[PDB]
Description:
Pfam families: RsfS
Strand content: 15-25%
Subcellular location: Cytoplasm
Keywords: Cytoplasm, Repressor, Translation regulation
Number of helices: 4
Strand order of the largest sheet: 1-2-5-4-3
CATH architecture: 2-Layer Sandwich
Structural class: alpha+beta
Protein name: Ribosomal silencing factor RsfS
Subunit structure: Interacts with ribosomal protein uL14 (rplN).
Amino acid sequence: MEIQEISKLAIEALEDIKGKDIIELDTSKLTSLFQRMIVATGDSNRQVKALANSVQVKLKEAGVDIVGSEGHESGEWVLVDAGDVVVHVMLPAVRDYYDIEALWGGQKPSFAVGAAKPWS
Length: 120
């Protein structure tokens, strides 16, 4: 389907498992790697991995092969690479720590809950 089509499919998928603070950034004029990026939050590895799974299962039944996933194990920061669009599902403390949204000119959602050991 169309670039912003697969995007809405990945977002809806993140919504099927109650994803928190879901956002979509247009990296179009920032890199050639991908056009649209999505960053959603999962309150627990369980939810994070479920959000990650939902995104893959949804894009597959729609005929959108996935380049591959990463970090689906620990469930702290899972990256579902879908070619021109990629989804980032990560724990609140993790999202805030790395703040990859800022990079692509995006503001990370309010946290203030605790992240003294983001590497732990």
